[PDB]
């Protein structure tokens, strides 16, 4: 299969999906530094395997750090082998 082995980035930017959309407006004081939270803001050091800063273009097919788009998560270089699938809005090969 190999899908699970190369799914390192799948579980890195998934938990926090809705952890700030409805919290930033209400907790803007905590979210925004009132300067310096040298201790509270450094708590991200403890998780060394999943964090917002660890985003690496999730690709379960090959696990490489390339090939992602937050808008739809569609191919940008694999299009060469999947140009007929119709998954190329906005970004397409530049020959025309």
């Amino acid at each position: 299969a190999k899908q699970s082995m190369k799914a390192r980035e799948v579980k890195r930017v998934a938990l926090a999906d809705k952890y700030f959309a409805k919290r930033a407006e209400l907790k803007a004081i905590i979210s925004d530094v009132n300067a310096r939270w040298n201790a509270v803001l450094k708590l991200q050091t403890l998780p060394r395997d999943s964090s917002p800063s660890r985003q690496r273009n999730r690709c379960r097919q090959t696990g490489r750090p390339h090939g992602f788009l937050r808008k739809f998560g569609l191919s940008r270089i694999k299009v060469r082998e999947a140009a007929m699938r119709g998954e190329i809005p906005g970004l397409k090969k530049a020959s025309w």
Binding site: A1, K18, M84
Partner: protein, 206 residues
């Protein structure tokens, strides 16, 4: 190999799809994982089922999977107990009461998967293949489907060299979208290497 998969090109045509829908932008990962899990885990144990086609669709948070079988004898099994077990397994994997439907199919002549499987079995039987190729072509032509093409890989006997033959006969307009062409390649692990067989069927028009 500059060719392209006809099924992928037929995404915008009434022919059945594999993965396409419109939904919220924050639920792509889980939905894709569920679709991959159900597709991968709904065919591995169906080796003896000989199901003609299983299609899983998720338009908008709804599953309407369709199953078409080829031979009633080889799929009924022990009074359909295996079918019920598979339905329960897929339902518990998805967590919802999937509306499973079974549609009877017959005439194992114009089905690309069945003819490809028969060709692979005959090749594995240690018998001649060109005669089987011609027989399949003429059988397909006899029952309609004006247009068909076949192709086999090499690796014959104890020879590392490989050759490719087509023996095409009829109309196989791959370039034109309005051709309702069907194709499903298969492979067989023979004594020396793996032999791949590809079949294209042009079953009339819209």
């Amino acid at each position: 190999g500059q060719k392209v998969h006809p099924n992928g090109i037929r995404l915008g045509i009434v022919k059945p799809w594999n993965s396409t829908w419109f939904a919220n932008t924050k639920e792509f990962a889980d939905n894709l994982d569920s679709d991959f899990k159900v597709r991968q885990y709904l065919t591995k144990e169906l080796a003896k089922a000989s199901v003609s086609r299983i299609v899983i669709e998720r338009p908008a948070k709804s599953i309407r999977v369709t199953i078409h079988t080829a031979r009633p004898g080889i799929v009924i099994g022990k009074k359909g107990e295996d079918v019920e077990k598979l339905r329960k397994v897929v339902a518990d994997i998805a967590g919802v009461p999937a509306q499973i439907n079974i549609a009877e199919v017959r005439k194992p002549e114009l089905d690309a998967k069945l003819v490809a499987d028969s060709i692979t079995s005959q090749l594995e039987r240690r018998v001649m293949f060109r005669r089987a190729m011609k027989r399949a072509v003429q059988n397909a032509m006899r029952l309609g489907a004006k247009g068909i093409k076949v192709e086999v890989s090499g690796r014959l006997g104890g020879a590392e060299i490989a050759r490719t033959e087509w023996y095409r006969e009829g109309r196989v307009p791959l370039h034109t979208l309005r051709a309702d062409i069907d194709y499903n390649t298969s492979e067989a692990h023979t004594t020396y290497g793996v032999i791949g067989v590809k079949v294209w069927i042009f079953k009339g028009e819209i």
